[PDB]
Amino acid sequence: SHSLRYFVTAVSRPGFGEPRYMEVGYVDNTEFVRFDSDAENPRYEPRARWIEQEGPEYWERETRRAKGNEQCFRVDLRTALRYYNQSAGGSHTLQWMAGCDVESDGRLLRGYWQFAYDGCDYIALNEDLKTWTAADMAAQITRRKWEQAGAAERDRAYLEGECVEWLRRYLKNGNATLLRTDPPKAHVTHHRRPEGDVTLRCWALGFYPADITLTWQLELTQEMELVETRPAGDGTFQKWASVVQKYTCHVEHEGLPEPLTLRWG
Amino acid sequence: IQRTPKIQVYSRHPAENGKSNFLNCYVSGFHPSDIEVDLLKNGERIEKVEHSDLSFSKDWSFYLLYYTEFTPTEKDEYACRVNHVTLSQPKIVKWDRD
């Protein structure tokens, strides 16, 4: 139920020489080691307070990693435009994601290593972890060539080895984190919309982690109405679900053996 | 493929006009990245907010969050204006203090 993910992005700035290259790292959906090219004296900078405890070797070695992955994409965008006759004045983006998802029990759950171009998927690593799957004609050749090169074994080495050991390093080293433990104070509100278009709204606020399940019943299916999980400014998260006379809001969260039971109080 | 943004405007606290809180316009799931977001009070743009650095989701669709620390009242309406490149007209949303 935990994951470490590296997000890399290259953007084509027309009329401006340096294409915008950015990288952000995450444990679960928590951001850390954000990296930018348009910052004063650019290097890897730590956003989180707990990551600041790492050594300088992390910053020099890793910043060399960023340089390699940056000049690489610099050379790669001209390859994209050389395969695709497109107006150079247009702004294009190519994104590269590489992460590993491990369960709390230590067993590796799944690993992802994918690449997309201009919002359209390009090439991805299959669930088999030994075969690639390409999304367009251009990525077909990249997939075959990468097959003959056997990139899947080295990438599998990184995703099964180094990345898992690092993930355990971030979740194990900084143990003070993840202590908000999702303690939502969920209560239901009600108004009367004209012509009886009203809805009952269960509200769960201020929790953390973000994984949570809102439900409603006596409403169990095709009923309710909800929004996407939204982060609050406090570093917490919030959510609400509305239903169109015994109705109950049950919530699955992190807590003592107790979901939730709520009517109009 | 270009993805129209998902806009949710809301506050950190339930809105009862009495003391100070903080409000946030949360935009997620959009592509490309050329996104221009403004916080509007009573029709006029709020001057200086905090434009957070860009963040990427697992779905290639980025997400940004703008916010301010202020005290809400009962005689003012607030809104969020966004003009991505996917929509031809700048969209504006009202914060429902209910």
Next chain:
Amino acid sequence: WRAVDVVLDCFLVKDGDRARASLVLKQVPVLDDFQGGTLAQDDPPIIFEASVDLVQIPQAEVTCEISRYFTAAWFMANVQVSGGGPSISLVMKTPRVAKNEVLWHPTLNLPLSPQGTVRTAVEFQVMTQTQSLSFLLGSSASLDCGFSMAPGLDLISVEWRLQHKGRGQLVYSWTAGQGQAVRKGATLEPMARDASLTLPGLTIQDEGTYICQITTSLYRAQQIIQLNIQASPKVRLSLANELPTLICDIAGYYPLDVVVTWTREEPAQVSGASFSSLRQSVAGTYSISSSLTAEPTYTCQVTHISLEEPLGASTQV
């Protein structure tokens, strides 16, 4: 009549590029010294194709592409008609290489037959008749995927795999005698062989780019179909704040780009309405209302990727 010689010229790109060629399909069943640069004499015997009716095109967008698949040499070319057309991939085998006839330029290869052509036959192919398909939410779709195979070089396995939202999953797979499905049980149920996939009651999860992959004896080729899904929205209009306000609610729609204006009757196409926060339903279908204020006979037209439908409520005093 029936016997037809096809000539489709495209480019040739192989890295390790910029080299325009011209693929020829010798003779195909059809119902009812210029150009050049490079060209390959391709014949399609021992293997058949379904439609092959892409002739008399109003040229005055067929985009073919070749790529060497690495004695005899091997290639793969994929011809893609743009618009509402087909899409074919195919593998070409060269005759065995001899120590006598050695001709080609450049890149030091073989053979360029005395007619100035390569003169090779296709052995295996994968064709789709549909490229992008759009359905509704509850509907059921069939994404066809045919393939042809010469006697020999027999099948091994066929995998249906999709990619969407960033992540991808295997939908189906087969072997020499039996196969498996994931989630909904979406069978196919059939030298021209068929593996047309049929999906039942579609879901938002089903939206994405579907990929039909084929692994055979020494050859593995594949084709792709696009699947986009949309849901017809429901319409409503209300009034409150009394003085007064109007709420033109829109519910259960996919995708996300919906544009809404207003008109004020006695027209005036009253431009200027405010939206609200965005919400959606369990399945994933979105919903949002754009509030407004009235003054005393109205219309809240809605535009989506689906077609248009207006409605309006009067305003008394």
